[PDB]
């Protein structure tokens, strides 16, 4: 099965440069073209350009020119993208999509990559403070409060993925250069306190990964 594996999240200060990858699998790398699409927080979809994957030939959008620089590596079936002079408007999700056979360098884009998140700012990366949310003295809702962290993203699971039902993880919000996120989990009023319930929140940016057991008050 075709698969475009995009590098993890990044965080750079304005004017700094970032380079992201896009490793392919399940198909002949050098037979297609790889494009790079940008998607602002707002949910737009800008075209950055494409790469040949075989000859290395490239083409950009007069808008991203000079700023974006595509690169390709045949030995590792990997596509790269160099971003320079980054502003706050660059803080978006960058994708890499492969073309269809016969169309050449033009779309459609049958396959897309994970998607790389990029945050540009001078704010210092701060680890999150996870707080357990136990009901104040048939279904019982519990949760965790991930406060004061930077930058995005943050992975929060329950019982290491065990609990997947009745789980609601809300979008982080900004408190002046610092995020705050929460997550709730509904479970029948029996596996708790009887059985253990824990939230697993990870902040890659700071390599932080803490578990918090929700005990009664």
């Amino acid at each position: 099965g075709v698969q475009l594996q995009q590098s993890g999240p990044e965080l750079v200060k304005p004017g700094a440069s970032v380079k992201m990858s896009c490793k392919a699998s399940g198909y002949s790398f050098t037979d297609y073209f790889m494009h790079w699409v940008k998607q602002s927080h707002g949910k737009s979809l800008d075209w950055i350009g494409y790469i040949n994957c075989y000859t290395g030939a490239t083409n950009y959008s007069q808008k991203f020119k000079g700023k974006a620089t595509f690169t390709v590596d045949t030995s590792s079936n990997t596509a790269y993208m160099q971003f320079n002079s980054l502003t706050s408007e660059d803080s978006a999700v960058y994708y890499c999509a492969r073309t269809s056979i016969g169309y050449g360098s033009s779309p459609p884009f049958p396959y897309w990559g994970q998607g790389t998140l990029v945050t540009v700012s001078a704010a210092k990366t701060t680890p999150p403070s996870v707080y357990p949310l136990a009901p104040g003295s048939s279904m019982v809702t519990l949760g965790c409060l991930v406060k004061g962290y930077f930058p995005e993203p943050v992975t929060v699971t329950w019982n290491s993925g065990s609990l997947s039902s009745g789980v609601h993880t809300f979008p982080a919000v900004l408190q002046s250069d610092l995020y705050t996120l929460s997550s709730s989990v509904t479970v029948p009023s029996s596996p708790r306190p009887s059985e253990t319930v824990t939230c697993n929140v990870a902040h890659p940016a700071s390599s932080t990964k803490v578990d918090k057991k929700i005990v009664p008050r």
């Binding site: 037979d31 994957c53 000859t55 056979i101 016969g102 033009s106």
Partner: protein
């Protein structure tokens, strides 16, 4: 009357890039639903569809060359350029550029299944080999005999007998590409046993040889 003509380098070295142009008249890429595609044909092989471009600038390339072929049109100059990068010995063949009729319109709306007009075809040879004259060896013994135009490059090479006096029974087979990257053909002639010179000429290497066969 529609006309088409392929133009470009008759010879190219491996890895380099080949650029073929299709000159035409009798219609314009301004015409609706009209396209111009390319069809390649290796020596003694079947036809292979390469690509095709339309008035609307649409383009489609053979899955095999999806990243080596680039088709462009010059609506003005009435031309259609095709660029093939990283060429190899497997790309030597005759390239034809045909025209595809357009869909019947109705006030400008389509309401085509073939390449009605073709070109003359241009022969291209992808090789690194250098030009050199052919060696002529005799094929001494109805009765048969002939000459072996050896190790030459590139095609073609004209061969006649006795300044033309001979024809009956002469068989000049098509050259073969040797491992050397050079060619080699044999021109025989069958005549009466009781009846007991090949005029070889290699244009490029200006190698003209009229050997005798005893």
């Amino acid at each position: 009357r529609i006309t088409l003509k392929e133009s470009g380098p008759p010879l190219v070295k491996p890895t380099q890039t080949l650029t073929l142009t299709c000159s035409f008249s009798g219609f314009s890429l301004s015409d609706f639903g009209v396209g111009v595609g390319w069809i390649r044909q290796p020596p003694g092989k079947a036809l292979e569809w390469l690509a095709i471009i339309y008035s609307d600038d649409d383009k489609r390339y053979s899955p095999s060359l999806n990243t080596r072929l680039t088709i462009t049109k010059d609506t003005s100059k009435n031309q259609v350029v095709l660029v093939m990068t990283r060429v190899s010995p497997v790309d030597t063949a005759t390239y034809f550029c045909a025209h595809r009729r357009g869909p019947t319109t109705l006030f400008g709306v389509p309401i085509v299944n073939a390449m009605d007009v073709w070109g003359q075809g241009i022969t291209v040879t992808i090789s690194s080999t250098s030009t050199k004259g052919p060696s002529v060896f005799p094929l001494a013994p109805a009765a048969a005999l002939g000459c072996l135009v050896k190790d030459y490059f590139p095609e073609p090479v004209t061969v006649s007998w006795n300044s033309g006096a001979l024809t009956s029974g002469v068989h000049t087979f098509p050259a073969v590409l040797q491992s050397s990257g050079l060619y080699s053909l044999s021109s025989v002639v069958t005549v009466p046993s009781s009846s007991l010179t090949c005029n070889v000429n290699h244009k490029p290497s200006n190698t003209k040889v009229d050997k005798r066969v005893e």
